[PDB]
Amino acid sequence: GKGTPSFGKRHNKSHTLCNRCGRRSFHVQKKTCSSCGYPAAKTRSYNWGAKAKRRHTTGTGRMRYLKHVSRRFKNGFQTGSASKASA
Amino acid sequence: AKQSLDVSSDRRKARKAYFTAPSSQRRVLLSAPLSKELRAQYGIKALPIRRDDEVLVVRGSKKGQEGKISSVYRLKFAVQVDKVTKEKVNGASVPINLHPSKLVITKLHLDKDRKALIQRKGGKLE
Amino acid sequence: AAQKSFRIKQKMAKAKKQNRPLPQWIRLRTNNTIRYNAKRRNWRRTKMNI
Amino acid sequence: AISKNLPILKNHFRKHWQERVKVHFDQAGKKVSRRNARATRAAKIAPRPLDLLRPVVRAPTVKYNRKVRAGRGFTLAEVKAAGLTAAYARTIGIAVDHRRQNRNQEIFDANVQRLKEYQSKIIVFPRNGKAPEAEQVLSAAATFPI
Amino acid sequence: AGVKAYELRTKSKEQLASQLVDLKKELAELKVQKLSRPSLPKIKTVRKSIACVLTVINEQQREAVRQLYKGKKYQPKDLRAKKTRALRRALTKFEASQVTEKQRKKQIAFPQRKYAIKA
RNA sequence: UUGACCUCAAAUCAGGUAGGAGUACCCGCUGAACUUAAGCAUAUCAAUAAGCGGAGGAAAAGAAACCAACCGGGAUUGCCU
RNA sequence: AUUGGCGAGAGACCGAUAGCGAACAAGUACAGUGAUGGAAAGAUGAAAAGAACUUUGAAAAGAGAGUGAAAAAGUACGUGAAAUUGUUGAAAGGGAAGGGCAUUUGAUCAGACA
RNA sequence: UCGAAUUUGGGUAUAGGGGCGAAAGACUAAUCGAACCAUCUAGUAGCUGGUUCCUGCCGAAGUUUCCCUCAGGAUAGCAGA
RNA sequence: GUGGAGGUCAGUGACGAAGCCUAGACCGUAAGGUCGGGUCGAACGGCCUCUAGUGCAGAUCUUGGUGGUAGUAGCAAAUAUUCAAAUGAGAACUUUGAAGACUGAAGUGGGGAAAGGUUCCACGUCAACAGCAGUUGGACGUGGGUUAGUCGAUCCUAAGAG
């Protein structure tokens, strides 16, 4: 009775969607994501899980802003606007 | 013999640069040599092909043919001469893809800019 | 399920929209390489886990 | 693991040593980089000569006191005796050591004469402007060997 | 066709505002068509034009508020330079070039002298 | 009655700063056991891994409460030894 | 100092079961309640010129044709081994088969004559 | 056995040398005389299995001594170079 | 005998390199070497040196592929089917009509909670799938469809969380 018959009563989620990482690792009664630690300010991570670290670090994502810090620095953070020449 | 410290003879680095080259870079890669006449006519050896130029295929099966460049197919690294085409079984016609290095330029399509270019390289013009 | 949250009904909507065959015109593009849709899902084969 | 007539070895490789191996692959690198670093300092430094004037000094201990050896700086006594101040001798490429003390006359006259010859064999451009280009001798150590 | 930026930049603040409503009625109508026509690429250009007017209506009201702020302490944060959160913090040249009264007298009195060796 | 002082409060008070990320390298805290000893507890692995706090383009160290015992040397760091 | 980051030059390095797990819509697809786990998968041709048309077929297809330097390259696509399979040809077989030395017979072949 | 120490949904608490146990070392997600996940970790192994071309010449030992030694080592002996 | 490296033979090659096939030939005791033919399509070898991720039959070896088994075990619980017409290339299995039966309201009927997430509905449609079939489908393709002051949530408090 521990096997197939009992599996029929599996129909209640222990985890739902984690606001901070959309992962279905948000424990309902515990109110905390087993993947990223929401709502704990610091994002959950360990040095024993280097894959899961890779699986999430900067650059696995849009980098909406960081994308451009390199180019901007390359030009000495230009305020202004380019002028004109000819041709 | 390379000598700068900012050229790379790396064969992998090159092929990547060519195939992944942006449109603006392929324009200059797709350069055709001017014809013997045109060369002494302009003091200039070759030029980035452009659309309404007039060209003679000096290589390949369509050796001898000539015509106007219909489209520069920068995506395909290939230029299409409207006059040099395949007919099919179902009669339908289809452009052949031609490469500017196997063409020769016979009558340029001159702009304000096309001239200033010829002069930027050190040419004279008619 | 049968009386859901908007978050869930929303996820299902985006789901539905991914359940379509390849737009055949893509098969024609230069250097095109995608043959079929390899992320096609079916409700009775792979459950989406919310 | 004891056998044969072999000398007992002491090969300390029982920590995670493979983690801390330093191969000086950049040996040629860092020499090229060190040469360029000096060629820039040379040019930044106007006709000034890359190093400062170092004193004579008798090396410590019963093993090295036979030899004489460049010390750090010139002591307040030698500087004065050679007729200039500490504060100024520094701007003239002379190294001064507030810590070294003078107990041996021989060394003392030696360094004070070393300062005479240094002063006599340099030229100090005016504060004004002119800047009468006079081309750098590069060391000073080489110029005034010990 | 399509709207041009330097041509908008001459129109009045309220000409431009009406241009937008012209392109919006325009757009809204094309969309009624697009569902009868198998394809309607026209819609792309009319929707890029809205974007272009809006950029201008915004570009103008901004360099308005810059200048009527230009040259004083305190101006909206989003007209202050971006740079780097830490570049923002760095000491300004002034509070950095600072030297103590005592040490100023030193740099003046004994400064690094330009000298050379030979004779 | 009126005005100070000390200490402590409140504001959607004027202006600012902190969090989080990353962490190869750097400053600390904390801290195993497998293992080796042909057993094993001291020891070893290791002042290592895992855990925690904090920085930079480097960090830290640094102008001697130093080394010496010499005819004395002369901030720190790093290499060869 | 630096198995991170930005930008560069390289190698007596690996060559798609190798090299990073990933040369590809790879930290994907898929598994797990979760922490986590985590693949496979590159190559027609110079060029689609990706086979008009005829015929048999319900269709898929077959058969002609046609393209091409080549379909002994047909989007199952370079070369296309092996195990294993069909067909054809040859041969042997009274409770395995295969092997050694030797010769008959059958098949097959080198060299040497001059 | 079947009207109660009854059955059962949802919510909720208890977490691994810990929980929970009308007590069987039972149950704690097909895992329980200590759950699952990753890491230390390529843990150690006097034990088991495997260890990839040809030819040529030479060619053994199961005995001595000491060993927490008796399925192992050191030592001598035999063997090659 | 293999991969890569220095030198050399101004070595072989699109008039066909490498590879693969071949009870065809030759050299070596052997590891192996050479040639013919066929397939093939872009590279490759000899000699002196250098170098190692350098040789497989085994490891209940790793990954992939393939057999004998074998057209075999099997496709037998849930009482059951039958006649005709229509459609269709094709009908034991689709649709319609007729008959025989079943569940027997503690349902094989009529709705919901959880869970799924479009399976619902229509049109088209059979390559795969539904361990016979298929013209049917919860399959494939293409579209349509979920309307609230009063039904729920939202509000309240419970153990508990914080």
Place this chain on the structure above:
RNA sequence: AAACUUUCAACAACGGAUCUCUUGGUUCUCGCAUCGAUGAAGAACGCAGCGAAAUGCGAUACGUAAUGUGAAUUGCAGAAUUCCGUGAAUCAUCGAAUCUUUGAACGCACAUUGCGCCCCUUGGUAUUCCAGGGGGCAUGCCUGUUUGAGCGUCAUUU
């Protein structure tokens, strides 16, 4: 004698070894120092004339402004006024903008597209109710401003 079994070969299967490839990996070296409340990194949902994904972007959505180039883009359609030109482009560059829902994540919550407060404004006969538009209200701490508390405590009133 067939069949069948077996062996060899040719042709055809199966399978993907081999050979040759390589916009990838791996290692070495050189140069450089730039995330974030001015909202980062990450997440979610969206955005094209015809897109599921990858890439890119944010209701200005495979992009807007600017600058350089000087005529494409291309699977199909397409616009055509854009070709001696403030001008093509799925171009390069990028100094200006837009930047949904979130996230340290900040009015409160959040298995909820749940529920407050203030200010300006518009409509509804309205300072008070409803609705639309805009702009706001987290915490610790520093300097200062203002308003206060306490026989902690100094003086000053008659």
